[PDB]
Structure 1
Amino acid sequence: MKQGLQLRLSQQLAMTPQLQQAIRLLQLSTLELQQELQQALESNPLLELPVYQGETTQTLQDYLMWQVELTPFTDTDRAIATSIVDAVDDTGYLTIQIEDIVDSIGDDEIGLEEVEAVLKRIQRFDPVGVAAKDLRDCLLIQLSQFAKETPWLEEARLIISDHLDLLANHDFRTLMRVTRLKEEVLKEAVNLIQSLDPRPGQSIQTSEPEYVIPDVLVRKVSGRWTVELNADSIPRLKINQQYAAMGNSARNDADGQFIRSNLQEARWLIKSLESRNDTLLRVSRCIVEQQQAFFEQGEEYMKPMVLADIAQAVEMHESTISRVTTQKYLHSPRGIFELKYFFSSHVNTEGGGEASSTAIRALVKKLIAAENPAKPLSDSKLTSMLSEQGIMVARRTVAKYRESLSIPPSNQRKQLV
């Protein structure tokens, strides 16, 4: 070869300030978009039972104080009490350390023992052992309360005391040799412990809202299901007529010009927002066509795809499709998904075919869940199971996936039958 400064050929590229703004325009959500678009509308002048129910509710923390009021105590005890039950979660254990609470008092007289008292007084209130300060003892408090008469009590009390690590790593072989408990009788002690309500505060608050706005819609009319955009959601600008009919007859150059410039802007912006929409519908549509599959079938039946796959079905560039897919959610019979979502990595199976990781990762989740609970399936054992299916994933892939689904290991999910 040789080094020189010659010239090449054959290409195509063009851009401008205003067009740029028109292009970034479809990369951001309608709700966050409509904001940007309201702002345009201030700048451009030619472009356009009182309390019902209001039922105040309980709230747990609010519940804790109602009994604080009718507990008897001093002003210092009622001050620390407000401090303590101030700092308590929806779950119900306390957020701050107890020595921290002492720093919140800012009093020389106040002592840890004094705090130990007011705390424990309000530690068995409603519901049981709440304001825990790190569960272990919360369990120990609920144990505390009920009668001696129930068997296996001392057993559950021994384990819960200082053998927590033993129970969290589910190493019952070690548990047996350490605690020197009964073989497959301890099981029922552990079952007692199991039914004791960890997270006793949660209970109170339950009233949680409904909240998600689908951008596009897709819905099984006779087969060949068809996409239509969300009418209510879609933003729309409409020309002001008054001001349109006040540019010509205008007597001054200032005014006349003024009105022309704005109309120019405005017509352009309309046309640009109009563009956003069309793209996105054309595109919605083109992604669900290929992914016909998936709606009926499930997460398993998803074909593995890349943007290229969906860009070459349209005439637009890849990046463009990438900008229009971000944060749009499209509602379907099956549920609400982000449009991003469809797109994933492939892996190569037997028979030349490829499989979407998403679908394999859905597959792994069903397979792992639906197994004998005495013998957990390890990752590699699964790799082998999948290979029967044809997937030929490898073991770290599967670990990756198996740990992504927020599911812990096999030796760690082993339990007593």
Structure 2
Amino acid sequence: MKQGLQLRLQLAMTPQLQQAIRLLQLSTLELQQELQQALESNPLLELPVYQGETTQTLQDYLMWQVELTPFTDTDRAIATSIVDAVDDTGYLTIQIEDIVDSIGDDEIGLEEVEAVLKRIQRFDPVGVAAKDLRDCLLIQLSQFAKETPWLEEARLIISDHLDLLANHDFRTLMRVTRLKEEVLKEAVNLIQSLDPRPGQSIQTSEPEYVIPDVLVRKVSGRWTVELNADSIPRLKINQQYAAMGNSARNDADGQFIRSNLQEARWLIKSLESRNDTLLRVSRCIVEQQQAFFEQGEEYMKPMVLADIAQAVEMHESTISRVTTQKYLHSPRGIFELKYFFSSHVNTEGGGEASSTAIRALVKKLIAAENPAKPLSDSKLTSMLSEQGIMVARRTVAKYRESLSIPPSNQRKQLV
């Protein structure tokens, strides 16, 4: 009747489940780190060489040549110091002045440092120790014979006209360099194949790093999702200490051991239940994925924390902590749980959902517009009109930045 609020409807909190959620929101790698750092005191809580082959790593390959090259002790020291602060791309990390300071010799000067670098500038490969790469591509072209045409045009452009090509400003470039029409592009292309980051070329090899935590294998539609068994932590109750407590003459001390053990059993069961709740949540998510992942991120409905926590009895904070730093390997592959949710929109697909791979493939088509110039946001809007889903140019710029696409008047290139 006469509405309002009226009295109706305390105790003591503890951070127990709170610390547990701190673990769950924390990633399982460091979460297991704590799990070990936890189970340590809880006593009831459970060839050498193979192939053994060394490698060059490039800089030592440079040193191999330096050893065969004639060099003095100060020359060897300067070259070695130059080698010490070297980047993967093969450009010089520190300037010549920093190298002169590192040599710490008044006899060592910038000119001697430059001479040492130049004698070692193009030994292997061309354009090593690029030193703010620019003269590096210059030395690379200089290595090429002048018999190659348009070498002069490319050289004049690289001399002091890097900015004109930086914005892809072909008209301003032609107006400045007086470069030939439809021919200066030839010098540009000869410059384009100039082995940039040539030192980056040596580096090629890596091992694998992604942890499948849950596995949905699309088992006969509506994937049979399953976590990783070995990755799931588990303790073993000290049954010896369980039998070392009651019979303890201090039946008090031993039964208290039993009580602490029972409490830890509760803790472990709660963690397992956290895993299982995450698992049933994963069942709902996999029901979603049998269409979304199967239709890919393009046909994916944006979901919310509210939406998922509604399907469960889990609290919104409960889920919000539960999935933090979680990733599962699927038929698609290893995919992060934090990636699962997405913001919805005002598109005229009849509904609200997220751009995602739609935005990515939109960037793809905008690039796929005539390679002369990047497609503007109006192109995206028309593409969406064809898609029948509402998208806006501010929204287009947003989704493009999400796909990290180049700007419309920055990605224009000579076809």
**What's the TM-score once normalised by structure 1's chain length?**
0.94
Tell me, what secondary structure is at the counterpart of 2:291? helix
Distance 1:207 1:350 in 2: 46
Residue 117 of structure 1, CA deviation: 0.5
How far off is 1:368 after superposition?
Answer: 1.6
- Change beyond 3 A, Cα 1:213–1:19: closer
Contact conserved, 1:46 with 1:262, CA < 8 A, in 2? no
> What is the deviation of 1:19?
3.8
Partner Cα distance (2:183, 2:160) in 1: 19
Give the Cα separation in 1 of the matches to 2:277 and 2:398: 35
Stretch moving more, 142-151 or 28-37: 28-37
TM-aligned CA deviation for residue 209 of structure 1: 0.8
Retained in 2: the 8 A contact 1:48–1:237?
yes
- Paired residues of 2:157 and 2:177 also in contact (CA < 8 A): yes
Alignment partner, residue 331 of structure 1: 329
- Displacement of 1:130 after TM fit? 0.7
Query: Residues 39-63 of structure 1, C-alpha deviation per residue, up to 9 Å, x if partnerless?
Result: 2322122232321111111101111
The whole-number CA distance in structure 2 between the counterparts of 1:295 and 1:270 is 33
- Displacement after TM superposition at 1:102 (Å): 1.2
Q: Secondary structure at the match of 1:64?
A: helix
Q: Is the 8 A contact 1:83 1:101 kept in 2?
A: yes
Instruction: For residue 21 of structure 1, report the CA deviation from its aligned partner.
Output: 3.2
The 3 A distance-change label for structure 1 pair 195 and 213 is same
1:348 CA displacement? 1.9
Per the TM alignment, residue 386 of structure 1 is displaced from its structure 2 partner at its CA by 1.4
3-state SS, counterpart of residue 269 of structure 1: helix
Distance in 2 (CA, whole Å) between partners of 1:303 and 1:6 is 41
Deviations 1:162-211 (A, max 9, x none): 00001111100011111112110112111111111111101212121111
Residue in 1 aligned with 2:5?
5
Alignment root-mean-square deviation, CA: 2.3
User: What is the Cα deviation at residue 15 of structure 1?
Assistant: 4.1
Report the CA distance shift for 1:24/1:157 in structure 2 as closer, same or farther (over 3 A): closer
- Tell me which of 35, 40, 44 is aligned to 2:33: 35
Distance 2:143 2:24 in 1: 61
2:345 match: secondary structure? strand
Deviation (angstroms), 1:351: 5.1
Cα gap change, 1:15 to 1:359, in 2 (>3 Å)? farther
Conserved? CA contact 1:44–1:262, under 8 Å: no
Where does residue 313 of structure 1 map in the other structure? 311
Alignment correspondent of 1:405:
403
Q: Residues 3, 356 of structure 1: CA spacing in aligned structure 2 closer, same or farther, 3 A cutoff?
A: closer
8 A contact 1:140–1:160 mirrored in 2: yes
| Secondary structure of 1:217's aligned partner | strand
CA distance in 2 between counterparts of 1:368 and 1:21 reads 48
- Contact map agreement 1:170 1:413 (CA 8 A) in 2: yes
8 Å contact from structure 2 (residues 222, 286) kept in 1: no
User: Residues 157 and 74 from structure 1, CA distance in 2 versus in 1: closer, same or farther, beyond 3 angstroms?
Assistant: same
Secondary structure of the corresponding residue to residue 39 of structure 1? helix
The Cα shift of 1:388 comes to: 3.1
Taking the aligned partners of 2:219 and 2:135, their CA distance within structure 1 comes to 57
Report the CA distance between 1:359 and its aligned residue.
3.7
In the alignment, structure 1 segments of 5+ residues that lack a partner are none
* TM-aligned CA distance change 1:269 to 1:402, over 3 Å: same
Per-residue deviation, 1:253:
4.7
Cα offset, 1:269, TM superposition: 2.1
Aligned positions, number: 415
> How far is 1:270 from its partner?
1.8
CA distance in 1, matches of 2:17, 2:373: 62
Cα 1:197/1:25, change in 2 over 3 Å: closer
Q: 1:182 to 1:299 in 2, by over 3 A?
A: same
Q: Give the unaligned 5+ runs of structure 2.
A: none
Cα deviations by residue, 1:117-153 (Å, 9 ceiling, x for unpaired):
0010000111111101011111100011121211111
Name the SS of the counterpart of 1:297 in structure 2: coil
Deviation at 1:254, TM superposition (A): 5.5
Aligned counterpart, 2:220: 222
SS in 1 for 2:215: strand
Comparing 29-38 with 83-92, greater Cα deviation is found at: 29-38
- Give the secondary structure class of the aligned counterpart of 1:228: strand
Q: In structure 2, how many angstroms separate the alpha carbons of the residues matched to 1:243 and 1:351?
A: 63
> Does the CA-based 8 Å contact 1:30-1:234 persist in structure 2?
no
3-state secondary structure, aligned to 1:207: coil
What SS does the corresponding residue of 1:128 show, helix, strand or coil? coil
Q: Residue 266 of structure 1 corresponds to which residue in structure 2? A: 264
Change (3 A) 1:37 1:355: closer
Q: CA deviation at 1:407?
A: 2.2
In structure 1, which of residues 280, 289, 295 is the aligned counterpart of residue 287 of structure 2? Answer: 289
Contact 1:30 / 1:235 at 8 angstroms: preserved in 2? no
Percent same amino acid at aligned positions?
100
**How far did 1:403 drift?**
2.0
The whole-number CA distance in structure 2 between the counterparts of 1:196 and 1:306 is 48
Cα 1:334/1:135, change in 2 over 3 Å:
same
Aligned pair in 2 of structure 1 residues 257, 175: CA closer, same or farther (>3 Å)?
A: same
Q: Distance in 2 between matches of 1:54 and 1:73?
A: 32
Query: Is the Cα–Cα contact under 8 Å of residues 291 and 303 in structure 1 kept in the other structure?
Result: no
The C-alpha deviation readout for 1:365-407, integer Å capped at 9, x for no partner, is 2222322111421123322321332222221221122123232
Contact 1:283 1:314 (8 Å CA) reproduced: yes
Deviates more, 1:368-377 or 1:114-123: 368-377
Contact map agreement 1:374 1:416 (CA 8 A) in 2: yes
**Would you say the 8 A contact 1:28–1:326 is kept in 2?**
yes
Range that drifts further, 296-305 or 253-262: 253-262
Residue 257 of structure 1: CA displacement?
4.3
Deviation at residue 22 of structure 1 after TM alignment:
3.8
Cα gap change, 1:17 to 1:100, in 2 (>3 Å) = closer
In 1, are the aligned partners of 2:366 and 2:379 still within 8 Å (CA)? no
